[PDB]
């Protein structure tokens, strides 16, 4: 699909609250101002927060829950300039448009909104929040924003839920809103969620797609994100095998700890290697068995880079097809075998020994 001509998208996380100010009465050519205005929302609940008094510009304002019709379904929606129309955080494609250019103000780029005239007015929120799981707690209703308003200012320990019927779209939407408001918050509060969560990891993958979609036009934020199960358990094991001064210690802790030492050894930590290894997709990717995603790692002013596989000269395909090859006069099977026999003899070892000659890329 695409956005029909004469419609525009404004993203702002602030639109998680209704931006009563911004909208202005549309008018047709000939200055035919249309003070009749109608607005559409995910639920009747949305209406309860929205105030007619904010719009003296208009004499006539109405609001309804959107519903996805059938018969009007068209790439080109029906037109009715006789009323201004607005959709606020709409979920699904709209079949009808108001006066002049219609505009939508939404937090989230749906796939429907891809091929579209879009603006973001974005800003970085530096503060990454966090999850935590213990298995005191604030019970936060999993949908209603302002039911717990100012509680989300006061506390940092937020329990979440959902009802069985909930549309996954609604789930994503609410989670997005919560994360935006958290990134506005001044301290990293802790998520806790009472759900089987496998589908939540699926929805996280969706979020990854979404964030990429944004980044197609985005602010290139350093937004924090993590694999949430494979990684999770692995790092847990890592800590367990180490001393555990804080079982609650954030991964980024260990990350930066290794950062302290990477450059002096000019070679890649196994932690980071297993990262981008055991993600389903953004890794060696068991999704498609793609270790080919070797990391080329560079630092300021370097004449050289660190590949997955040793030092490399800059901006070149990771390994020369020609080389000072591993000439078979070394790595002759026979020699390897003889050495192996020697070794096994000496060790008195019956089993479990294998050896392989080393190999070299651009540099030795």
């Amino acid at each position: 699909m695409e956005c029909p001509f004469q419609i525009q998208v404004c993203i702002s996380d602030r639109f998680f609250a209704f931006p009563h100010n911004l909208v202005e009465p549309q008018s047709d050519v000939g200055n035919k101002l249309i003070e009749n205005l109608i607005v559409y929302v995910p639920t009747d609940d949305d209406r309860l927060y929205i105030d007619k008094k904010q719009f003296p510009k208009f004499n006539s304002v109405l609001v309804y829950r959107h519903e996805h019709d059938v018969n009007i379904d068209s790439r080109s929606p029906k037109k009715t300039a006789s009323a201004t129309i607005v959709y606020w955080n709409p979920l699904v494609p709209i079949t009808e448009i108001g006066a002049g250019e219609t505009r939508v103000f939404s937090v989230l780029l749906t796939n429907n909104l891809f091929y579209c005239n879009t603006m973001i007015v974005h800003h970085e929120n530096p503060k990454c929040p966090i999850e935590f799981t213990y298995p005191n707690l604030r019970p936060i209703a999993c949908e209603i924003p302002l039911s717990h308003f100012k509680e989300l200012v006061e506390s940092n320990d937020f329990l979440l839920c959902f009802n069985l019927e909930t549309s996954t779209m609604v789930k994503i939407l609410s989670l997005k809103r919560i994360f935006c408001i958290f990134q506005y918050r001044k301290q990293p509060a802790r998520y806790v969620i009472n759900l089987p969560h496998e589908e939540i990891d699926n929805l996280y993958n969706k979020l990854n797609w979404e964030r990429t979609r944004r980044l197609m036009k985005g602010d290139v934020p350093s937004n924090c994100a993590t694999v949430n199960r494979s990684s999770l358990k692995y790092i847990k094991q890592a800590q367990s095998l180490l001393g555990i001064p804080d079982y609650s210690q954030t991964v980024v802790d260990f990350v930066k700890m290794f950062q302290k030492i990477i450059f002096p050894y000019q070679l890649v930590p196994n932690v980071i290697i297993k990262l981008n290894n055991f993600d389903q997709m953004v890794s060696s990717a068991p999704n498609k068995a793609e270790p080919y995603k070797k990391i080329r790692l560079f630092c300021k002013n370097d004449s050289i880079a660190i590949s997955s596989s040793g030092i490399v000269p800059i901006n070149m395909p990771d390994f020369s097809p020609p080389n000072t090859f591993d000439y078979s006069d070394y790595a002759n099977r026979t020699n390897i075998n003889f050495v192996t026999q020697r070794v096994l003899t000496d060790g008195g070892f019956s089993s479990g020994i294998t050896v392989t000659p080393v190999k070299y890329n651009y540099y030795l």
Binding site: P135, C161, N163, N194
Partner: protein
């Protein structure tokens, strides 16, 4: 697999072993985590099932209980459950075995006394023994029940949509009052079990409001649950399995063979049901 809390309890010593243990119902999955045996032995109640119609013979059912308190007792005797205010005196815990008292103080979150006793026990041989492990396993069970849901998901939804008004059916019963407001206070395990134990007198759905009794069988209480009528003399509660007067001024009743004539006719039971206020449901 067994999940009755009393089945989880184990004796500290070979003597006072938990013979007369939880019945097979401990294995069953009503989600009450209590054998009806212990429900009797500690609370004078027996669980029952209410069948319900899904507007149809198509199965719908809900758990209920009868109380066992006699018609004549008053005060403490009528109290079915205490508050944290008064559980100590109601139970006379020192009568009860130390592990029992432990568990109760855990239920009431008397962590001060709980950990005081724990700290005394630490170096005792019986507690360097795995009794500590036992207690922390019961703690993990509590986590798996409450932190998973009871004050969490269950509290959330009960405070989101499908609340029951555990409230006076008719405001003239001011002796009941807004004591439903006190439901907020109790530990989530207790709140859950209470909800599971007591039926509403009403249910609203888009299909109608359904009235399951004319007049409430109970009343809300100043500390914990107390068997009493909202109004009037207490309705006669019979009871089923010493220098006392036992006069019964019976009618002479010479009409023998009464049951040999009547036995086909329906033998209407008598045990007291439990009703309170209104439940609300969407589809």
């Amino acid at each position: 697999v067994n999940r009755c809390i009393f089945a989880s309890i184990v004796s500290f010593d070979a003597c006072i072993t938990y013979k007369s243990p939880c019945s097979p119902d401990a294995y069953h999955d009503d989600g009450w985590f209590i054998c009806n045996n212990h429900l009797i032995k500690r609370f004078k109640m027996s669980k029952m099932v209410l069948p319900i119609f899904d507007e149809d013979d198509n199965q719908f059912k809900m758990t209920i209980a009868r109380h066992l308190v006699g018609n004549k007792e008053r005060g403490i005797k009528r109290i079915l459950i205490p508050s944290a205010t008064n559980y100590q005196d109601v139970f006379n815990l020192n009568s009860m075995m130390q592990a029992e008292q432990l568990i109760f103080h855990l239920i009431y979150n008397n962590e001060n006394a709980v950990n005081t006793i724990c700290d005394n026990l630490k170096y005792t041989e019986g507690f360097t023994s795995n009794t500590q492990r036992v207690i922390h396993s019961v703690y993990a069970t509590t986590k798996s029940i409450l932190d998973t849901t009871n004050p969490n998901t269950f509290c959330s939804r009960v405070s989101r949509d499908e609340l029951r008004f555990f409230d006076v059916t008719n405001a003239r019963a001011l002796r009941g009052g807004a004591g439903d407001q006190l439901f907020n206070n109790y530990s989530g395990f207790l709140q859950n079990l209470i909800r599971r134990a007591v039926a509403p007198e009403y249910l609203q759905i888009d299909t109608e409001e359904l009235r399951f009794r004319n007049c409430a069988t109970c009343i809300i209480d100043e500390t914990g649950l107390v068997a009493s009528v909202p109004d009037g003399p207490e309705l006669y509660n019979p009871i089923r399995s010493r220098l006392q007067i036992r006069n019964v001024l019976k009618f002479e009743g010479d009409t023998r063979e009464l049951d040999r004539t009547l036995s086909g006719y329906e033998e209407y039971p008598t045990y007291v049901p439990l009703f309170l206020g209104y439940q609300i449901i969407n589809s």
